[model samples]
Target: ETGDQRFGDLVFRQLAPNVWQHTSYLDMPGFGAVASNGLIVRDGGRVLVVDTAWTDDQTAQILNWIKQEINLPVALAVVTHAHQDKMGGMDALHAAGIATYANALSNQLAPQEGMVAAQHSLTFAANGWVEPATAPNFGPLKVFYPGPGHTSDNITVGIDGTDIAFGGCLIKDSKAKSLGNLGDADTEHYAASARAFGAAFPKASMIVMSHSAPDSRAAITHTARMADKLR
Candidate 1:
């Protein structure tokens, strides 16, 4: 395991060979300070960010760390959903003049939720997978929208050559007792979405979440079980 490097409210730690998890802290109303996790994927001299943190400054801290420590130029940033925890720091990316990408539904809903939209929109096909070749800079990453679980526009990303699956908030860690924050969740389809998500990355060993530690592929099945009880 790689050591953790902290930058203010943001912390970067390696999760796999070339994938690092970037966590940022935010104070929730009754939860005190909560952590949100993102991903920093390095491929050759370029890097890609899976999700931004809670605020612009926190996101800037990530970019600063990459420039100073990693010394690699960020080729792109992809937001997994329209929630603030997922896309709030879009301004930081825009300020840095880096290209950004997200689900087309997320891009349309972001502004409505008081967040900036990503620069590029990724439309998934009937099979729920985006064309991996379209995002050449992101290495062999695969993007999938399993309908709706955490949010209507929530998406999951899988690093093709590795066992890492950036499930974002759609997947809860093993310790989670609930589905969590269903303000924008699709109650009727959350379960099916989780099932589809699990099917999409059946072989994934490490499934990353937004607000907790990474868990095994069982986390997806766990989420499906939890979601079933909700309906």
Candidate 2:
């Protein structure tokens, strides 16, 4: 793992056949170390990306990697959560005509936050990201919106055949003793969301948190237990 501090020029690790994890370090001059991660899953001739990186330059690097490695176009882009670090590069991907997906609520709430951040980003840093004009649907991929957890618009993504599920930022590692920065979270509904996910996807063998490495069923169950403890 090379630790070069470039925003989007990072390394890719193949997790499964055609499934890769892109890890990038967001050193935005004054922003310190913002370690962001994303996933690229290719099915058939189309690619399904989980999250876009921090900026257009970083996103371009990812696209270039896909061109060189997979030689396929991104058919879908899913914004796993409402953070700028995750979906900041949507404009670049959407400009390429890729259909974008996000929790329905993110479509509503993201713009409010995105607009503010866009202004600051443009003023301080040379950030050039924009919101998509069209809203994508929430089908094909089994998505569950159990109210709110990390944020009021949190949504989890589950694939059809595989036991893999993307828990966004709600379900962290089982050993994560404390909740990491719940500034935008709805604390009242967090526990309920955790339970709903645990119940809805009981058979999920693998759980991929938005950050950190993926976990097993047992580990996810432990995360649920921790949620209960917090309550």
Candidate 3:
């Protein structure tokens, strides 16, 4: 087990041999300081980041840490959605010259949300988005759009060769008592989307969702049930 490594406000916790969950914080109106987490996946000495921190500065710090410790260049970065919590660091990523990708819809909506759009497109899939494991840019990462939940363009990323999935804010943490930040959520379809995410990554031993600590696959079912109760 790896210990929590810190770099400014970002904290990295290893999940697998080359995978670590990075967490940063944001001060919300009613929620006070909320923690947001993403993934740092490494391959061939290069890194693949899933989502950025809550702001550009924090995202820059992420790059700094990677450069110093991981000692690898971030070849690719994927934003699971267009929300500030996901793509807010687009500027930093672009400045670093790392290719970035997001759901096509997210690219269009990100700028509207006061965040930068990802440079590349990640097409949506009715069942789930699965990039070929041989894709040159992202390596073994996969994205899935289970309808809509937290945001219309929200997506989940699955590490193809490992039991890890970044559910973003589409799937709530087990300790989350309710469907959160419904400002852009599709309440009517939230439950279905959450359920589909669980099915999409049936073998995911670790579930990484924004705004909370990484949880087990059961969190997916929990999020689905919570969304159902909203109706």
Among these predicted structures, which one has the highest TM-score? Answer: 1
TM-score of each: 0.95, 0.78, 0.93
Which segments of model 2 are wrong by more than 4 Å? 1-8, 28-32, 115-140
Q: Report the lDDT tens digits of candidate 1 across residue range 1-231.
A: 248888776788987888889999888898889889999988887988899999999999999988887899999999999988989899999999999999889999988999999988888788898866555556767889899888999999988888888889998976678988899999989999988988898888888899888898778888888999888
lDDT ranking from best candidate downward: 1, 3, 2
Q: Tens digit of lDDT per residue, candidate 2, span 81-137?
A: 678767778777866777677655576667777711211110011121122233233
Model 3 lDDT per residue over 75-156, tens place: 9998888887788888999998999888888888876888888888777545666444423467778777888898888888
lDDT of 2: 0.66
Candidate 3: stretches off by over 4 Å = 130-136
Provide the lDDT at 10 for model 1: 72
**Which 10-residue span in candidate 1 carries the lowest summed lDDT?**
131-140
What Cα-based lDDT does every candidate model obtain?
0.88, 0.66, 0.85
